[PDB]
């Protein structure tokens, strides 16, 4: 589990804006396949419906689901049937997907280990992608503490994200 090869950004936003901000990223980034992380199961459910309101296909997985159910979803996502996946935290989430070049923390985690489980990759060589963290004013404390505890750096999103970082 490594961060090397992952370009990490953040963006400041209000809670009531996160859905409008997420749509902007949908229109700004060259997403092959996406994964979007929320902090609660119901938050995963509602976000999935909001993304569908916007017109994109949406899968989703959370802990309260059934393992037999998460398998069908993950397998279909793998094969590429739907492009975006919203999900909560899972001890046994699964292998990494090669077509996922954009991970989004729709909600910023509180512990550094969770960030590593969300943004980490298997092996430093090969995989290339970007991570975008949506942080509220309140989340700032956890942002500096998380990078210091990890030894990584999370920079403000730039005007243009070079495709060579995730395409």
């Amino acid at each position: 589990l490594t961060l090397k090869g992952v370009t990490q950004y953040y963006a400041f936003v209000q809670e009531r804006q996160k859905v409008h901000c997420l749509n902007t990223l949908f229109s700004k980034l060259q997403i092959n396949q996406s994964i979007i992380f929320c902090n609660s199961t119901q938050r995963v459910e509602l976000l999935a419906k909001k993304i569908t309101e916007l017109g994109y296909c949406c899968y989703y997985i959370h802990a309260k689901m059934a393992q037999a159910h998460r398998n069908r979803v993950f397998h279909d996502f793998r094969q590429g049937l739907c492009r975006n996946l919203v999900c909560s935290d899972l001890f046994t989430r699964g292998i990494d997907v090669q077509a996922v070049n954009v991970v989004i923390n729709f909600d910023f985690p509180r512990m550094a280990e969770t960030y590593l489980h969300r943004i980490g990759r298997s092996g430093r060589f090969g995989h290339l992608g970007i991570a975008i963290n949506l942080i509220t004013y309140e989340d700032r404390f956890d942002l500096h503490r998380i990078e210091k505890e990890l030894g990584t750096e999370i920079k403000p999103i730039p005007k243009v994200i070079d495709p060579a970082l995730y395409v």
């Binding site: 950004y9 953040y10 963006a11 400041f12 936003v13 209000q14 809670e15 009531r16 804006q17 996160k18 859905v19 409008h20 901000c21 749509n23 902007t24 229109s27 609660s40 119901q42 938050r43 509602l46 909001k50 309101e53 916007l54 403000p156 999103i157 005007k159």
Partner: peptide
């Protein structure tokens, strides 16, 4: 506690959107 999210309330489909030098979103 599971509250009603603030973003589930307001209209999700609005045009525009960008980020400024400080990384703050402009809706």
């Amino acid at each position: 506690d599971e509250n009603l999210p603030e973003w589930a309330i307001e209209n999700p489909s609005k045009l525009g959107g960008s980020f400024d030098a400080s990384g703050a979103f402009h809706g």
